[PDB]
Structures are given as structure tokens and as C-alpha cells.
Amino acid sequence: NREERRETIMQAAMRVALDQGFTGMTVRNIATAAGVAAGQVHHHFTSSGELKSQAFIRVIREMMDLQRLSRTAGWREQLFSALGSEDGRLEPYIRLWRQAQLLADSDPEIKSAYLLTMNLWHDEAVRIIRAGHAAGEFTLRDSAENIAWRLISLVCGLDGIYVLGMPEVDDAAFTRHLQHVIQLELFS
Amino acid sequence: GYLNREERRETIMQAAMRVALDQGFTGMTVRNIATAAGVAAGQVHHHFTSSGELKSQAFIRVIREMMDLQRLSRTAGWREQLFSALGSEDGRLEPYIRLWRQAQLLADSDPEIKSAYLLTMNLWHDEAVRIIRAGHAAGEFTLRDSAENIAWRLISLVCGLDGIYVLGMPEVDDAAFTRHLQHVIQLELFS
DNA sequence: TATGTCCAACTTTC
DNA sequence: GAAAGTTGGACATA
DNA sequence: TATGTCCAACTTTC
DNA sequence: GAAAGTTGGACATA
């Protein structure tokens, strides 16, 4: 069945999302990027809110794909990558991710989508912690689920300060802080 | 009656503070603050460059007042003091916290508020550093890192958890928040 | 206010 | 019945 | 609307 | 009488 038209529109939304952010994700812009009439967008999606939400989730999934293709030499390093990869190709995705966090306060649809990405992120960290524990590399004094929420909280809070302009919390300090908490949570 | 410049400014600032806590930034209009202070609307710009300056400075004062409340909590130890400065469950602080959250978001579109929010983070950090240094000197805290690094990580944990908590995450409620904060304090200062 | 922007429903055309 | 075209007002903002 | 900005007249203090 | 402080509104603007 020719579901390619829906995927064509979706991929247009993904590209507009990464290039212009949520502000640029109008029916007209997406339709132009997809090369279709504006009527077809509603013909394949209930509303623009659904499209923006689904397209945002697709972008976050692509981000996680990009993070996973980086192979590391240990579960410690794979956890750091999953929580704070330095790969520059993730920057456009992280930018959209931050915008969704802000819009979540006023948009319930984006809030729902944003909440899902947190769970997808949490699940990823949980899988890595459980594997490293079974490998004998990680020592667990607490549940993987609890450890993962604290590490994600550490990253989000530290990133909230980083974006402000703190010279004391730059990319270098971010790395050292993340490595330090991994040491405390999983190597004690 | 008539007041000197410093006194008049404080009356306007005090009104701006109570409006912020009662109605948030949205309620902090020139006329609403001036009426709350009992002064002519023009008095605001006689004593502040702009409403943006007034909002930012008043916001800072509110956060300061919050930090005063927490600091006078009469704790029984440096651990309890640090927990209070990071995650006090005192219900009196909630109106201050809601304004704090509001400023974090507005900082994305308002440089004045962003600069003011930046200051509150430093003020918060300064207090955490002092408590950590005090507990270390008192023999209560064990430090494997500088108090400055420890403080930023504890503050980041709090800010990060609060963001998740605000989302409605059932696995991260008020009880979990406390447990997580108490647990990281153990890792950082008692390991 | 009122002005720019945007969209889900409606209308016409084929 | 489907695509193309039009509407009216919602929404945020000058 | 309603909200920010600014000022010429007015009132109090010196 | 001058200086300081205050007022209400005009005007433009988010």
C-alpha cells in the first residue's frame, strides 16, 4: 500500500523541525518541503498538533539512533554516551529537545510527547546499567531505574545551567561532572 | 507622605515583591505594582530604568527572601542544613519556588530575567558551598572533590529532578524527590 | 485594540 | 467521492 | 485592550 | 524661593 505519501510528509516535518524548530512546523512549510498540496497534510494526519508531536518523536528516535551507532569499549563509556555524548551531529536534535521542554509548559500535546522521550531516554539508561551490572562492571547499591532518573536529572539540570552562560559549567565541566557521578553511582 | 529616594524605591520594590509572590510575573504591571505600593504609576519610572529592571530586581529580592527563610530553619546538623538549602519541604517556600520556575522559562526570552536568574543560581551555589565547607571543617562531610564541584552537581540534580517532577511523572513524586536528594548527599559527602 | 499568523471545517469543482 | 479551493475565527502579538 | 514609557504641573520639604 | 518629591495623564506600544 502507498503509505509513502504519509512518510514523505512526515520526513518533511522532521527536516523542518531540525532546521526551523517547532515555530517553522506549519502546514504550509511542511507541505512545501514535502512537495504536496496543503490539503494532503490533513488527509494523512488528524491535525497539525499530531504531526508536530509524531514528527518530534521521530526526530528524537533518529537522535538516539545516531548516539547508538557510536560503539564504545565498555559499559561505562556507553552510559556516558547515552547520557552526554559529545558527538556534534546530535546538536540540532538536542536543540529541538530543549524547545520541546519549554513548550511542554504551555502545550499539552508537546508535553505528552516530551514525557515519552524522557521515558525512552530512561529506558536506554536502564538497559545499559542492567547490562553493565550483569557484566560485573557496575556495582549497584540501588535500582537501575532510580540510578537512571538521577543521572538524567543531573544531565538536565546541568544543561539548564550550561545554556545560561556559566563559564564555570562548560562542555568540559559537563563531561567531568557526568563521569564523576557515574563513578559514584556504579563504581562504589 | 513624602519619602526620600531610597525609602520611596523600597516601597515600590516591596510592592513588586508581594505582587510577584501573589500573582507571578504576569501580575507585575506598572499600575498594579504602583497601586499595591499606594503610589502614583509614574513613581515606578522615577526610580527604575524600566519595568524589566523592576521585575528582575524584585524577582531577585523574592529569591533572597526565600533563602533567608530556609537559612533560619534551625537545623540540627550540616547534613540537615544542606538538605534544607537544596530540597526543603517547608510549604512556606512553595510560592517562592513557583516564581523561580517561572523565571527559568522567561529567561529564554528575556535577557534581564536571564541575567537575574543567573545570579540566583550563583547565590544558591554560594550557600551550598559554604555549608559543604562548614560540614567538612566540622568533621561531618567527607570531601573527595572541591565544594564548588559538589555544589553544582547537587544543585543540578535538584533542578533536573524538579523539571521531571513538574512533568507529572508518577515514578518521580515528592517522596521520590526527597529520597533521591538524600541519596546523592550520601554519595558526595559520606563516601 | 488590531494586526499578523495559522488551521480545521466548509464549499466548489472535477 | 476525492481533490482543490475558500472560509471563519482562533491564537498570539504590534 | 492594557501595558510601558515619559513629562509638565502640582505638593511638600528645605 | 529653590529643591525635592509626587501626581495624573498623554502618548506609543506588547
mmCIF file of C-alpha atoms in Angstrom, chain A residues 20 27 40 42 52 112-113 124 141 162 172 175 178:
data_model
loop_
_atom_site.group_PDB
_atom_site.id
_atom_site.type_symbol
_atom_site.label_atom_id
_atom_site.label_comp_id
_atom_site.label_asym_id
_atom_site.label_seq_id
_atom_site.Cartn_x
_atom_site.Cartn_y
_atom_site.Cartn_z
ATOM 1 C CA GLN A 20 13.436 25.742 11.897
ATOM 2 C CA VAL A 27 1.113 23.047 7.388
ATOM 3 C CA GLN A 40 -2.884 16.252 1.824
ATOM 4 C CA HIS A 42 -4.664 16.861 6.973
ATOM 5 C CA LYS A 52 4.300 18.085 15.169
ATOM 6 C CA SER A 112 2.957 14.294 26.306
ATOM 7 C CA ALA A 113 5.499 13.773 23.519
ATOM 8 C CA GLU A 124 18.035 3.382 27.399
ATOM 9 C CA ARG A 141 23.612 -0.083 45.621
ATOM 10 C CA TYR A 162 25.129 25.340 30.783
ATOM 11 C CA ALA A 172 34.438 20.296 29.740
ATOM 12 C CA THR A 175 31.833 15.864 30.951
ATOM 13 C CA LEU A 178 28.852 13.255 34.373
#
